[PDB]
């Protein structure tokens, strides 16, 4: 790829699974008789990441769209495969096995997911504040996590309740179908600009949508597919 | 004819206790009370307030 990026080629760089690189240069070093650090990995873990991708940088000749994958051992987000990762990055997208669990195909964890990018100067004024609301919610979700769990929505103030039913809308929301999803599931793919995007959440946090059901925005399109959807159920 | 039925809303003397010798009426608030009222209002307040404590402290 660095031919094509040094002749000024725009180029979209997907690796996949670099935490598979990580294991290999692991299993080589326990070969190789090195000593082990942390949990079994090589000891030249962090310079063998820096080699690998410092190599994948967009530079004044070319520009190269990196996309990656990485996988956690386990569960473990401590692990030292990710963590080296994580500060290689511009835009960090985290999948959690519970919310996956809970049927939310993309699994995207919008709390411990970030970017450069989001700022108002870059991507808008009202798209940064979108986002930064759909945080503040769900943020207080898990805050109030706990709270629902052991005692109910109940004892939360009217406020506290709204914040929460809205958290909830709004992570079945996030889920969304794919076009190669339809080999095991039949619902068609959706593909909803970030404009839209942006809209539908702006639409959802303002206090529209509130009297439609959680369960209506389950993998659906924009917001006017959820009314769409509403209204064909009345 | 056969039955007597007074819906009095309130009753003062009577000889079975009146102000003297009265005991059921005495401390009978209390009765009513240690458990009902007095000290159990501040009980259950305990019991939210312990409560609401550690609700914090475990988030």
Same mark, same amino acid.
Not at chain 1, 42 to 52: D, F, I, R, S, W
Not at chain 1, 100 to 108: G, K, M, N
Not at chain 1, 216 to 234: I, R, T
Not at chain 2, 8 to 18: G, K, L, P, S
């Given at each position: ?234 | ?27 009978? #608030? ?5 458990? #009902? ?5 501040? #009980? ?14 475990? #988030?």
């Amino acid at each position: 790829a660095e031919y094509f990026r040094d002749e000024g080629r725009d180029i979209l760089l997907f690796i996949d699974n670099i935490f598979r690189f990580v294991q290999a240069g692991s299993e080589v070093s326990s070969l190789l008789g090195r000593m082990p650090s942390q949990v079994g990995y090589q000891p030249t873990l962090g310079t063998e990441m820096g080699e690998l991708q410092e190599r994948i940088t967009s530079t004044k000749r070319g520009s190269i769209t990196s996309m990656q994958a990485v996988y956690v051992p386990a569960d473990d987000y401590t692990d030292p495969a990710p963590a080296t990762v994580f500060s290689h990055l511009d835009a960090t997208i985290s999948l959690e096995r519970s919310i996956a669990e809970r049927a939310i195909f993309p699994a995207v964890d919008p709390l411990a997911s970030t970017s450069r990018i989001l700022d108002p100067n870059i991507v808008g004024e009202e798209h940064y504040r979108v986002a930064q609301e759909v945080k503040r919610v769900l943020q207080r979700y898990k805050d109030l996590k706990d709270i629902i769990a052991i005692l109910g929505m109940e004892e939360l103030s009217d406020e506290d309740k709204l914040t929460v039913q809205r958290a909830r809308k709004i992570e079945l929301f996030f889920s969304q179908p794919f076009t190669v999803a339809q080999q095991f599931t039949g619902r068609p793919g959706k593909y909803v600009p970030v404009k839209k995007t942006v809209e539908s959440f702006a639409r959802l946090l303002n206090g529209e949508g509130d009297h439609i059901p959680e369960s209506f925005f389950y993998m659906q399109g924009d917001f006017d597919d959820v009314l769409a959807a509403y209204e064909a159920s009345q | 004819p056969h039955r007597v039925t007074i819906l009095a809303d309130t009753v003062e003397r009577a000889d079975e206790i009146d102000e003297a010798r009265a005991e059921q009426a005495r401390a009978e #608030a209390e009765a009513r009370r240690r458990e #009902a009222q007095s000290e159990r209002d501040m #009980a259950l307040a305990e019991a939210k307030l312990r409560k609401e404590m550690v609700r914090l402290r475990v #988030a």
